[PDB]
Design a protein around this ligand. Structure first.
Ligand SMILES: [K+]
Ligand SMILES: [K+]
Ligand SMILES: [K+]
Ligand SMILES: [K+]
Ligand SMILES: [K+]
Ligand SMILES: [K+]
Ligand SMILES: [K+]
Ligand SMILES: [K+]
Ligand SMILES: [K+]
Ligand SMILES: [K+]
Ligand SMILES: [K+]
Ligand SMILES: [K+]
Ligand SMILES: [K+]
Ligand SMILES: [K+]
Ligand SMILES: [K+]
Ligand SMILES: [K+]
Ligand SMILES: [K+]
Ligand SMILES: [K+]
Ligand SMILES: [K+]
Ligand SMILES: [K+]
Ligand SMILES: [K+]
Ligand SMILES: [K+]
Ligand SMILES: [K+]
Ligand SMILES: [K+]
Ligand SMILES: [K+]
Ligand SMILES: [K+]
Ligand SMILES: [K+]
Ligand SMILES: [K+]
Ligand SMILES: [K+]
Ligand SMILES: [K+]
Ligand SMILES: [K+]
Ligand SMILES: [K+]
Ligand SMILES: [K+]
Ligand SMILES: [K+]
Ligand SMILES: [K+]
Ligand SMILES: [K+]
Ligand SMILES: [K+]
Ligand SMILES: [K+]
Ligand SMILES: [K+]
Ligand SMILES: [K+]
Ligand SMILES: [K+]
Ligand SMILES: [K+]
Ligand SMILES: [K+]
Ligand SMILES: [K+]
Ligand SMILES: [K+]
Ligand SMILES: [K+]
Ligand SMILES: [K+]
Ligand SMILES: [K+]
Ligand SMILES: [K+]
Ligand SMILES: [K+]
Ligand SMILES: [K+]
Ligand SMILES: [K+]
Ligand SMILES: [K+]
Ligand SMILES: [K+]
Ligand SMILES: [K+]
Ligand SMILES: [K+]
Ligand SMILES: [K+]
Ligand SMILES: [K+]
Ligand SMILES: [K+]
Ligand SMILES: [K+]
Ligand SMILES: [K+]
Ligand SMILES: [K+]
Ligand SMILES: [K+]
Ligand SMILES: [K+]
Ligand SMILES: [K+]
Ligand SMILES: [K+]
Ligand SMILES: [K+]
Ligand SMILES: [K+]
Ligand SMILES: [K+]
Ligand SMILES: [K+]
Ligand SMILES: [K+]
Ligand SMILES: [K+]
Ligand SMILES: [K+]
Ligand SMILES: [K+]
Ligand SMILES: [K+]
Ligand SMILES: [K+]
Ligand SMILES: [K+]
Ligand SMILES: [K+]
Ligand SMILES: [K+]
Ligand SMILES: [K+]
Ligand SMILES: [K+]
Ligand SMILES: [K+]
Ligand SMILES: [K+]
Ligand SMILES: [K+]
Ligand SMILES: [K+]
Ligand SMILES: [K+]
Ligand SMILES: [K+]
Ligand SMILES: [K+]
Ligand SMILES: [K+]
Ligand SMILES: [K+]
Ligand SMILES: [K+]
Ligand SMILES: [K+]
Ligand SMILES: [K+]
Ligand SMILES: [K+]
Ligand SMILES: [K+]
Ligand SMILES: [K+]
Ligand SMILES: [K+]
Ligand SMILES: [K+]
Ligand SMILES: [K+]
Ligand SMILES: [K+]
Ligand SMILES: [K+]
Ligand SMILES: [K+]
Ligand SMILES: [K+]
Ligand SMILES: [K+]
Ligand SMILES: [K+]
Ligand SMILES: [K+]
Ligand SMILES: [K+]
Ligand SMILES: [K+]
Ligand SMILES: [K+]
Ligand SMILES: [K+]
Ligand SMILES: [K+]
Ligand SMILES: [K+]
Ligand SMILES: [K+]
Ligand SMILES: [K+]
Ligand SMILES: [K+]
Ligand SMILES: [K+]
Ligand SMILES: [K+]
Ligand SMILES: [K+]
Ligand SMILES: [K+]
Ligand SMILES: [K+]
Ligand SMILES: [K+]
Ligand SMILES: [K+]
Ligand SMILES: [K+]
Ligand SMILES: [K+]
Ligand SMILES: [K+]
Ligand SMILES: [Mg+2]
Ligand SMILES: [Mg+2]
Ligand SMILES: [Mg+2]
Ligand SMILES: [Mg+2]
Ligand SMILES: [Mg+2]
Ligand SMILES: [Mg+2]
Ligand SMILES: [Mg+2]
Ligand SMILES: [Mg+2]
Ligand SMILES: [Mg+2]
Ligand SMILES: [Mg+2]
Ligand SMILES: [Mg+2]
Lengths: 142, 258, 163, 166
RNA sequence: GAAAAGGAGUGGCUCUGACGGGGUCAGAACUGGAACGGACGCGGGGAUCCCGACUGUUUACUAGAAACACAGCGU
RNA sequence: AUCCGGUCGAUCCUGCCGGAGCGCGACGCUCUCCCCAAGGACGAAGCCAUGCAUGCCUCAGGACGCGGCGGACGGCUCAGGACAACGGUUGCACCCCCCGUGGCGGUCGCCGGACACCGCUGGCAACCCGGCGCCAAGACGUGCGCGCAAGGGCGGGCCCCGGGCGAGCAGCGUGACGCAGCGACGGCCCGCCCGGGCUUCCGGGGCAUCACCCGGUCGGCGCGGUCGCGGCGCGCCGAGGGCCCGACGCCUGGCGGAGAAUCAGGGUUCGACUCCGGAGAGCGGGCCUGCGAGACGGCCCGCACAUCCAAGGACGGCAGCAGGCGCGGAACUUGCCCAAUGCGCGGCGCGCGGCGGCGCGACGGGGUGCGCGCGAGUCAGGCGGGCCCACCCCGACCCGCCAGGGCAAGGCUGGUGCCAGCAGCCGCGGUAAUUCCAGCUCGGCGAGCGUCGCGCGGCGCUGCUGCAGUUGAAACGCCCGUAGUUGGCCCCCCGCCGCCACGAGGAAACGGGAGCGCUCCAGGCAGGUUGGA
RNA sequence: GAAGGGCCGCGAGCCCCAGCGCCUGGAGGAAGGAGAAGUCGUAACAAGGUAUCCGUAGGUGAACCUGCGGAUGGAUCCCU
């Protein structure tokens, strides 16, 4: 029947499934551990670091713009990442040595939109949420 | 562990002790002696949780200190004392003499009796053996022993005991056709007649009984206590060991509020 | 200490097995008595109490001639054979099952009653009899036994032959 | 462990799979109009309790007419539905447990009982008067708007005699 | 490649086992400045580069080699 | 038992990308009232200042001391360990056991001196001890007594099959050894009990870029040791034992189960923590005392770390409760009480366990009005409570967060002019922007909404149920062939497997489920002859 | 009968050698990917101006060219 059958083939019906699961990119991506290694966050929702430089990023082929980002040095493992600073005007609140908190764009570490090479974003600067900081709910000291 | 166990969590307590899952993290653990840990109910859980003679441990203790509790004709002072099947329960200050039997859901009930009734004890002959210098002994289900036993008394039969003098007066023979009550299993508390004793080499022997309304059941031979010879030698509760089924029980639970 | 736990042995396929606890007291081993011939009996306190008698330097034992049914006490003279090794023979070390020469003086009144085993009588006329130890000296502090006869006697005499 | 670790607790509502759906998004505020519902969790809760009686009924109806489990839980289910008034007397067969709705559950709230009995001008007035503690159920004073009244306790709805309204 | 590299034992005396008169091989106890192939006989080792494949031959009397020869290959 | 948007000038597909639900944590914004309730587990089994976590009663006002019983139970954590452990299921005719219960008790004239508390004198920085002396036993020591502890020799049937069994098992007798235990307030000893040790069978992670693996390893004989069986150990003899039905080796950010999350059915994933079982107390080891420990709130040594000190020396183990440091995205008081629940000993002790505090992790209920009366607060008294308070009762006063082009419910003015910015995906923006920044208006769920990471679903894109293989990805160039898988028709009424049903036997809690108005409810097992089936 | 000593049994710590992971510096060398609007040609899609494509061997700045056997997915379902 293009599949094996018969009452005494359970071992083969299990061997086939075990071998063919790895041909799915999602099962392999979530069960092989090489991504758990290559992941800058080491499998967490967020991580902190200090800002090392402010940069601008030229948008991808259809659009045209200069998005805003920061080069971040992670505290927990001493790695280099880039984080897109959202929400118009916020790039002023990111000084040259700040403790920033970094989370994702979604899509489990895939680029989003037209911003090339960035898979992370900053959500807190110096203990303050950047949403409220934009929305004038809290203010950085001086 | 590195030694024996002293404590006992409430959830790990036997299901038929009818404890409640709130009201503590601990349970009373029975003490060693005349009965086991699974087929028993302690003295404190009878007095304090059933009859309200004491509302607490701290005043059940003193009832047992001034020696108000006669078990098997002899007093006791240990709250965790394991009382079990056929034990005699007489408190004189309230004029109450009982024997322990099982209900038809596997729980311990205290049946009223009379002063002409509390003079004897039914024991199950667990085994016959030889001790010092070659002497015979019979050891029973209540952890009594009797030496120089009459040879007609054989294993698994039943004896009748005097609580004072400690000696055998009557015995009943486990044969095909004896009125008998179960003590474990899921037919615990039911009474019938021995009508099959099927034996198997190496392994357990099975026993098949029937109530006096036709319903039949099976168990191991370890769970068939003998009470008489086509008539019980002791009293039994007004349900007499006949079990209703779930719908009959449900209508009775409907009636008691109706 | 010394242990007889199996966890340090391999499986029945030869694979190294893992280690999941530390040594337990209830699997202890002790060193052995190595009872020398020719008078100490130590006491050993075992699990739960249980005095164990552990011998060193025994000299005498109770010996039984079965077919004639005569028992006497006697002085172990020499250990002559042992099934395990020549070393325990050469050291006169009293273990269960070894074969020894015993003094003949106690059994010399049996030299009167005839119709008895001549292979025992002519040996009583000498100054020793051949016997086997039946007890465990290191566990019960005693070395008692019986005198040989049957095919077994001939077997050990041939083992002792002047080869 | 502290003894509070051993207490049971449970969620009582289920949220629909497609939220932004116009046709029932409209008939859903219609119900918040015909009764006085704070929000949608009290429609979710009614669907939750209807779903379970439906599931039990389908389990029993898979089974066979002379069977013990039918003989036990069908009679139990009908008795409890009839005494809560979710089902009325003339329908004494299990197959009628399938054609109920949310609305017959809502009918036996106090807010509906006292409007049948005309104790309140409306349902919104009935709500406010419920929380004002002015209506009792058989000599005992009931603060609950969502209160579910058995047709035995349904003759004894009235103003609570300890009130500024007698 | 290789005795690669690297380790451990080895005397005297008293015994025991195996091979069908003859020695060998294996094992144990005791003992000696903490010694034992006690003289004699008897490789130091390793990581690499250049030249010539190899054994062989040569300037008797200052050159033994990378020089000559060689099997193989070709005209 | 459900789809949707994204590959064309248009069109039908395959195929992924993106959206729509529940749960677990973390981050942001916001917060009226009550009830329930988790809380330094997350490749830091990292380190700990301070206090507390174990005591209770024979011999004289009392303390102190002696003696006794307990401290091996209870609490914490998940590092190690993948034919382990663990789960069900056997067995010990191979074993050990305190207390308690019931038995049993035959053993070849009131003794002796001495120890602590205490007196007199001391050493030492502090830790801790010395010398001399007068004083008891339900303390030792010795022992008054009718012979019986361990072990050993003989006492069996030479088709085969009651003391007790399925099973030659247990007793006893009789020849030798020995002198143990119990006796100065009579107990050695024996059944039962709970607990332990080991033990039969079935289940018991991933990798083939790990194909051969093991050598006390596989079996035999003999002794030793053990509470006991056994290559458990040692001597001698043999050459066995495991493997494509996956051995062996390597890896794991591996504690197992009872269980939990998801949701038509079949399934996928997780099993830190409530119960049970295991294992540890910074890491190797060793041991004493005791019925019971290879114990760490016991001791001894090596290592890595810290502490006081006159410089000679002494000394520690928070993976116990609070609290501190460090780490990390991430986790509360340096409270009061033994009153309940249980345990110990005996009326007390107990950081078990309880009662308050912090506590938008999460759960359940009720408001911000109705057409004219209330709760939220305040002040008094009850009730409750170890002491206060919260709930209940009686008196007098009194929203927010995301959006508005489509997926997907909801549309005018000003600014900016591929900039700034939005945008999960399609896409928006070039000086008339349905998408940016704002104002007005309207939508959504709602004391809670949004963002991030993961599990399940969506997914018949893992397919047993149930996918695809002419051309979209995909039939080995062919024939032979072992393991494996599969194999026509026939006799019925025997035996042995498989299968189907019904039983017996073992755990609660959870999950269902009968009955019961904590005012309802998340609950709990109540309650008015009862009950927890 | 204490200190102290002799031989073995258990077994730390260190040394020394080999295995076994896993991470990482490096003159040079050589790939892949994105920003790109930089040179040089025109190999393919039409008979793409020499039909295209498979296997193999050799050769040229580059795409590519050539020989030997194959295929139509061809530019032919059609002839003693
Ligand atoms: K197929
Ligand atoms: K298929
Ligand atoms: K196939
Ligand atoms: K088949
Ligand atoms: K497949
Ligand atoms: K444990
Ligand atoms: K133990
Ligand atoms: K114990
Ligand atoms: K419990
Ligand atoms: K409990
Ligand atoms: K107890
Ligand atoms: K108490
Ligand atoms: K040991
Ligand atoms: K241990
Ligand atoms: K032990
Ligand atoms: K020598
Ligand atoms: K040369
Ligand atoms: K040569
Ligand atoms: K040469
Ligand atoms: K020269
Ligand atoms: K030369
Ligand atoms: K040369
Ligand atoms: K040269
Ligand atoms: K030359
Ligand atoms: K489905
Ligand atoms: K789209
Ligand atoms: K489309
Ligand atoms: K197309
Ligand atoms: K499509
Ligand atoms: K932690
Ligand atoms: K920690
Ligand atoms: K931890
Ligand atoms: K983790
Ligand atoms: K103790
Ligand atoms: K202890
Ligand atoms: K204990
Ligand atoms: K903790
Ligand atoms: K673990
Ligand atoms: K681990
Ligand atoms: K004990
Ligand atoms: K105890
Ligand atoms: K086993
Ligand atoms: K087994
Ligand atoms: K097993
Ligand atoms: K197994
Ligand atoms: K594999
Ligand atoms: K060997
Ligand atoms: K052996
Ligand atoms: K051996
Ligand atoms: K061998
Ligand atoms: K494997
Ligand atoms: K771990
Ligand atoms: K499946
Ligand atoms: K399912
Ligand atoms: K299922
Ligand atoms: K599914
Ligand atoms: K499904
Ligand atoms: K937890
Ligand atoms: K735990
Ligand atoms: K656990
Ligand atoms: K537990
Ligand atoms: K446990
Ligand atoms: K345990
Ligand atoms: K445990
Ligand atoms: K342990
Ligand atoms: K450890
Ligand atoms: K330690
Ligand atoms: K350790
Ligand atoms: K240790
Ligand atoms: K040890
Ligand atoms: K140790
Ligand atoms: K820990
Ligand atoms: K820890
Ligand atoms: K605390
Ligand atoms: K931190
Ligand atoms: K921090
Ligand atoms: K208490
Ligand atoms: K506490
Ligand atoms: K009011
Ligand atoms: K008020
Ligand atoms: K008012
Ligand atoms: K008022
Ligand atoms: K407001
Ligand atoms: K916006
Ligand atoms: K997404
Ligand atoms: K989309
Ligand atoms: K404009
Ligand atoms: K799927
Ligand atoms: K499905
Ligand atoms: K197919
Ligand atoms: K094609
Ligand atoms: K391909
Ligand atoms: K093929
Ligand atoms: K193939
Ligand atoms: K083939
Ligand atoms: K073939
Ligand atoms: K074939
Ligand atoms: K086959
Ligand atoms: K197959
Ligand atoms: K087959
Ligand atoms: K076939
Ligand atoms: K079957
Ligand atoms: K239980
Ligand atoms: K490198
Ligand atoms: K450019
Ligand atoms: K061409
Ligand atoms: K060309
Ligand atoms: K061309
Ligand atoms: K061509
Ligand atoms: K072409
Ligand atoms: K061509
Ligand atoms: K070619
Ligand atoms: K060529
Ligand atoms: K060329
Ligand atoms: K060319
Ligand atoms: K070319
Ligand atoms: K060419
Ligand atoms: K060409
Ligand atoms: K070509
Ligand atoms: K050419
Ligand atoms: K050419
Ligand atoms: K060509
Ligand atoms: K050719
Ligand atoms: K071809
Ligand atoms: K084609
Ligand atoms: Mg508990
Ligand atoms: Mg040369
Ligand atoms: Mg020369
Ligand atoms: Mg914790
Ligand atoms: Mg688990
Ligand atoms: Mg401890
Ligand atoms: Mg501390
Ligand atoms: Mg952090
Ligand atoms: Mg699927
Ligand atoms: Mg061309
Ligand atoms: Mg062309």
């Amino acid at each position: 029947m293009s599949k094996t059958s018969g009452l005494y083939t359970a071992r083969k019906l299990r061997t086939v499934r075990r071998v063919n699961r790895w041909a799915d990119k999602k099962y392999r991506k979530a069960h092989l551990g090489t991504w758990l290694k290559a992941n800058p966050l080491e499998g967490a929702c967020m991580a902190r670091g200090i800002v090392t430089q402010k940069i601008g990023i030229s948008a991808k082929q259809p659009n045209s713009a200069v998005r805003k980002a920061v080069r971040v040095q992670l505290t927990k493992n001493s790695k280099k990442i880039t984080a897109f600073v959202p929400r118009d005007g916020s790039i002023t609140y990111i000084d040259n040595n700040d403790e920033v908190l970094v989370a994702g764009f979604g899509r489990a570490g895939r680029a989003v939109g037209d911003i090339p090479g960035c898979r992370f974003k900053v959500i807190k600067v110096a203990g303050i949420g950047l949403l409220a900081l934009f929305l004038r709910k809290r203010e950085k000291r001086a | 562990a590195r030694g024996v166990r002293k404590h006992l969590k409430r959830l790990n307590a036997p299901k038929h002790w009818l404890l409640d899952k709130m009201g503590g993290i601990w349970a009373p653990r029975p003490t060693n002696g005349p009965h086991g840990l699974r087929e028993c109910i302690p003295l404190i859980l009878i007095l304090r949780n059933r009859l309200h003679y004491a509302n607490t441990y701290a005043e059940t203790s003193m009832i047992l200190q001034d020696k108000n509790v006669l078990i098997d004709g002899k007093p006791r002072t240990d709250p965790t004392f394991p009382v079990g099947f056929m034990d005699v329960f007489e408190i004189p200050k309230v004029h109450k003499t009982f024997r322990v039997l099982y209900d038809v859901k596997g729980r311990f009930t205290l049946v009223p009796i009379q002063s002409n009734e509390a003079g004897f004890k039914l024991c199950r002959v667990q085994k016959i053996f030889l001790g010092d210098k070659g002497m015979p002994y019979l050891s029973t289900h209540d952890a009594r022993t009797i030496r120089f036993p009459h040879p007609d008394i054989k294993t698994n039969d039943t004896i009748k005991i005097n609580l004072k003098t400690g000696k055998i007066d009557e015995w009943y023979k486990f044969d095909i056709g004896k009125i008998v009550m179960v003590t474990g299993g899921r037919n615990c508390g039911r009474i019938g007649t021995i009508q099959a004793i099927d034996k198997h080499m190496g392994s357990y022997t099975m026993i098949r009984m029937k109530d006096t309304e036709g319903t039949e059941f099976l168990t191991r031979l370890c769970n068939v206590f003998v009470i008489g010879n086509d008539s019980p030698a002791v009293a039994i509760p007004t349900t007499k060991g006949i079990r209703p089924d779930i719908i009959k029980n449900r209508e009775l639970r409907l009636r008691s509020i109706a | 200490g010394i242990t007889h736990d199996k966890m340090y042995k391999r499986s029945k396929t030869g694979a190294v097995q893992g280690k999941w606890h530390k040594k337990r007291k209830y699997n202890l081993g002790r060193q052995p008595a190595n009872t020398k011939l020719i008078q100490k009996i130590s006491t050993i306190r075992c699990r739960g109490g249980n005095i164990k008698r552990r011998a060193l330097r025994l000299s005498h034992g109770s010996f039984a001639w079965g077919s004639a049914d005569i028992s006497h006490k006697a002085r172990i003279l020499q250990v002559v054979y042992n099934s395990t090794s020549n070393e325990l023979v050469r050291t006169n070390t009293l273990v269960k099952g070894c074969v020894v020469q015993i003094d003949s003086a106690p059994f010399k009144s049996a030299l009167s009653n005839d119709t008895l085993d001549k292979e025992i009588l002519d040996q009583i006329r000498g100054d020793h009899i051949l016997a086997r130890i039946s007890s465990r000296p290191g566990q019960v502090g005693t070395a008692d036994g019986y005198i040989l006869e049957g095919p077994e006697l001939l077997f050990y005499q041939k083992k002792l032959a002047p080869k | 462990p502290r003894i509070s670790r051993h207490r049971n607790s449970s969620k009582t509502y289920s949220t629909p799979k497609k939220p932004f759906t116009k046709p029932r998004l409209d008939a859903e505020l219609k119900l918040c109009g015909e009764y006085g519902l704070k929000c949608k969790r009290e429609i979710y809760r009614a669907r939750y309790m209807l779903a379970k009686i439906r599931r039990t009924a389908r389990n029993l109806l898979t089974l066979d007419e002379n069977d013990i489990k039918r003989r036990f839980e069908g009679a139990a289910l009908l008795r409890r539905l009839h005494m809560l008034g979710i089902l009325d007397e003339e329908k004494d067969q299990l197959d009628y447990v399938l054609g109920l709705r949310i609305e017959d559950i809502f009918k036996r709230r106090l807010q509906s009982v006292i409007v049948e009995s005309k104790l309140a001008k409306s349902v919104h007035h009935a709500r406010n008067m419920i929380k004002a503690r002015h209506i009792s159920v058989g000599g005992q004073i009931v603060n609950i708007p969502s209160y579910m009244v058995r047709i035995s306790n349904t003759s004894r709805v009235a103003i609570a005699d300890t009130s500024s309204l007698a």
